[PDB]
Amino acid sequence: SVITSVSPKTSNQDHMIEEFIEQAIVFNNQKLESGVLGYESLNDLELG
Amino acid sequence: NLRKRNELKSLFKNKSRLSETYFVELIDSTLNKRDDRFHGIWKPGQTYQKGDVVYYNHSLWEMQSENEICAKEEQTPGISTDWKSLLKELEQKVDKLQHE
């Protein structure tokens, strides 16, 4: 085996490149804790 | 003793995330009337322990009795034999000298 590239005239596939847009970003990162001391801003402590 | 008002005020903001530490510095830096033995003005209904210091009329008083006591309405520093003060001993002694 020998590794080469993909071409639209030897196969029908190419490299797929698209543009990144800042305002359409979604994060995938969940907080480990919530609502407890040490993990929230002072504005968000509800004094339960 | 470790921090001033302008240093403690620097840890508590709306856009700041708090923690256990901030409260350690808050508790250490203010006056703990139990652990430093100072209660301000005498009030009936309290409980005191050996060594407490209290301000009653124009004098500071330290409690002598070794067991806890309940501050009774009609027992007041000067009447009872729990409390003590030097500004009264010296006052009476100098009054005696003045009279003599």
Q: Do A37 and B14 touch (CB under 8 A)?
A: no
User: Is residue B14 within 8 angstroms of chain A, CB to CB?
Assistant: yes
Of B93, B100, B57, the closest CA to residue B77 belongs to B57
Neighbours of B83 (CB within 10 A): 25
Instruction: Name the method of structure determination.
Output: cryo-EM
B77 in Cβ contact with B71 (< 8 Å)? no
Distance CA B17, CA B15 (A): 7
The Cα–Cα gap between B80 and B65 comes to: 11
Q: Which amino acid is at A13?
A: Q
Beta partners for residue B70, in sequence order: B47
